[PDB]
Amino acid sequence: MMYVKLISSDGHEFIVKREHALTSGTIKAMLSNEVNFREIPSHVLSKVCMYFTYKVRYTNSSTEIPEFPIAPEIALELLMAANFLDC
Template sequence: MSKDNVEQLKKNDWVKIVSCDGFSFVVRREVAFGSGHLKGMLDSSDGGGFEEAMSDGGGFEEAMSGICHVSERGIIVEKLLEYLVYKKLYDNSQNPKDVPDFQERIIPEIALELLVAADYYDA
């Protein structure tokens, strides 16, 4: 696989995140990489990167399959991934006034559990 093909695959590749209660979420790999924990699971563990994971099987099983099983409930994973998309979308915003407040999207019933998950997943 050429370096250009690997870079294109890395950018456009989709990954599946599966919650502990069986809900599946499909997001772009670059969005999932917004979480340090998910990036560590989906990238090669030997520090070589995506190319080695694709070529010689290095890294975690998740790096090869593109499927991560997480120990959070579906509603928490959904909100965590929603935040990662929000972060990717507004990361380079020139005007902070154009960025909507994400706190308005969080229902109080899941706030504490979401905070713990966000800390664990380094989001």
């Protein structure tokens, strides 16, 4: 399986399937096997990776879909990352 590496502003290295990271058009352009995010800290980029897993699992599936959870403390920062990454 093909993986890529996404690196947070504080140096945390997240390793995810290439298919999943291509969820983001912005990440696709930054690749086309590692990307550095100078503005996104690890407590936000970890949640981004969890969204990829959730989207790929629950897109086109009739098994009841659960709510994607977002703690209030990280919501503003996650919003800005989502806008940048278009996802």
